[model samples]
Target chain A: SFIKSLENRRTIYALGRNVQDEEKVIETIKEAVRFSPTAFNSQTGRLLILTGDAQDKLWDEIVAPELKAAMEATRAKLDGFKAAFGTILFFEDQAVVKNLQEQFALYADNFPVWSEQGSGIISVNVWTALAELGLGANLQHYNPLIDEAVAKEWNLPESWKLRGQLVFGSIEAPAGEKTFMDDADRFIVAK
Target chain B: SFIKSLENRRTIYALGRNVQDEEKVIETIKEAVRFSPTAFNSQTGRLLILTGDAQDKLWDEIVAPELKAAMEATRAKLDGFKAAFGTILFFEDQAVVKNLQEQFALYADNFPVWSEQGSGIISVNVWTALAELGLGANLQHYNPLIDEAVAKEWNLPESWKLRGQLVFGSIEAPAGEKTFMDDADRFIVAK
Candidate 1:
């Protein structure tokens, strides 16, 4: 089950546009996110899927120039994601979170954290779903730096705070080997 | 495959102690966490499995008193978690997050965010695995509220900052229907 899908999900940087039907891919992402559970059933997570020319503009016009200006990203990396079929921009709606905080003053401090957790859960769920669809993907955190430009370029709601980016397409190249740390250190069995 | 697992995973509060072998449950949690990927390969998520007397001590001695003093949780909710088979305290090593932030000064802001994402990923993965193992589970964020008492009670490292609590056991009662927000509000498609 879920463990198999979790194991199958990997960071695939070398992606290609030669993949499945674009409409099906969009529905897959929407369906996966729709079903993901959130704290207090807030469902505050938001998604912006950039495809076609919009996807190209995001990488070439926005990400490339911003990253190159800071020397934070290389052409190879930019080209890899840009060559992909599309990008899924993950965000958390601050309005819903703020409303939850106002309603539940006791958990005021936790609502933000819960919102982020909601987005993360949706991210992993969507990533796993994409993998099940036989697509290659990698999660990128190029936010704050590109957050302002992204919202302006896409005309997205200001309340949608960007969390991570899922760039996915066909598996032009496979993922490398993965190693695990000792379970003893990661877990403490208290009896 | 993954979508089905995600759908099956739910917040089941009415749990029972009639579950599988404790050791096997521990192993399942460890295996799932080990396989779950983290941001930048930072395996920073930690789990403290409290069972038998230890599990009781946590809810009875620590959480009960803490929550009661604040008038936060009722006897019904506290009793539910304490009576469950065990509780998995999810934590993220602050030391690891700090090291990554210092090492990657350019992306300092992202490490903290990534750590939270890792904790969220582990939480969802573990929750889904428990569901697969024929157990009911519900995630609780009674952290920062009971972090000090918890670390002292369990002899945990000061670096292990508590994130969430996952209380799981046999499915004594089924979960209620889950509702979803409109996809148009949650997702923006730029084609």
Candidate 2:
């Protein structure tokens, strides 16, 4: 069941050293995101499947800044492992969506926001699906920073906005102790 | 179990609504949203619970225009309920989050984008939880139109950005088929 899969999701720090079939992981992600619903059915999302060098390129952008910010601290809490095989970069094709917005004025501005919202749904679904496929994944938001480098390297059009990055691989370390609030903190239902 | 709940979730639309306790529904929504993962855990999403006049006020502000536009066709369709038993308005609190982003520098700009994404997650969680409680719920989107009325009528601060609305009551009509792509269109497992 999806609940069982959801309960099992964890953000592992280090992934299993052995890599899984990268193509299969990519396929898993594609399927999950493809089936996700977008507002108004405007499929304005673009995904960049990164492996080997491309994935390494993103890590290059993130590791330095993160380490620099944490340099003085000896605890050095976040160590690394490129172990989990690949990364999936979710991008919002604002250009394609903007055109739709202009054509459909009433909710045009909503496309960008809704697409990004759709991306999160896709990402979480992908994460859960990956778990179903025996993969442990963590989500990252090194956008803007990584995105700048991403465009420079990939030569992506300005219309593509980086949403988030999903890293998948076997688990080495389990997620840390995370706590959640009681249900009463967020909902109200009518009879 | 969540999948089972997902299957069991009936869209509350008909008149013979087997109503769940109002507080129970609210609690379920709260629990689901509270546990649902948010972008950077920025719990910037806000939900407004409305019943009676408050619900009617929202309709006057937002849904009225759309209904009027389609009134020619939905004349009878629109007659069932003048007031929703409950309406929950979801908003993205950008300013408070922007404040956090500024001090952090690394992630401030990302907050605005993340909040909207977080709102989507909250919606999914809220609806699914309500479904679990044997309540019927539907997500509705009403933006700039209600954005103004909501602020004035409720005196909401300017920073709150309305994302979507949920109108729910005892099931008035059975939900039509929820068609999903076949497994051929989903799931890829890595060995």
Best model number under DockQ = 1
Clashing residue pairs, backbone N/CA/C < 3 A, model 1: none
Model 2's TM-score against the true structure: 0.73
Please state the error at residue A153 of candidate 2 in Å.
6.2
Kindly list the per-residue Cα lDDT of model 2 for residues B1-191, writing each as its tens digit.
33344455544444223465666666565655655567656577777777766666566645676557655673232333333467778887777688878878877667777777888767766665665655667666757655876777776778888888776666666777555434332232222
* Residue A3 shift from truth in candidate 2, angstroms: 5.4
Error of 2 at A40 (Å): 1.0
**Using TM-score as the measure, which candidate wins?**
1
B166: Cα error in model 1, Å: 0.4
Residue-level lDDT of model 1, residues B125-167, one tens digit each, is 8999999888989998888889998888878999999999999
* Candidate 2 C-alpha lDDT tens digits along A37-67: 5676566667776666555555655545655
lDDT of 2 at A83: 48
Alpha-carbon runs more than 4 Å astray in model 2? A1-7, A17-27, A51-81, A132-134, A148-159, A179-191, B1-16, B20-24, B51-85, B128-137, B148-159, B169-191
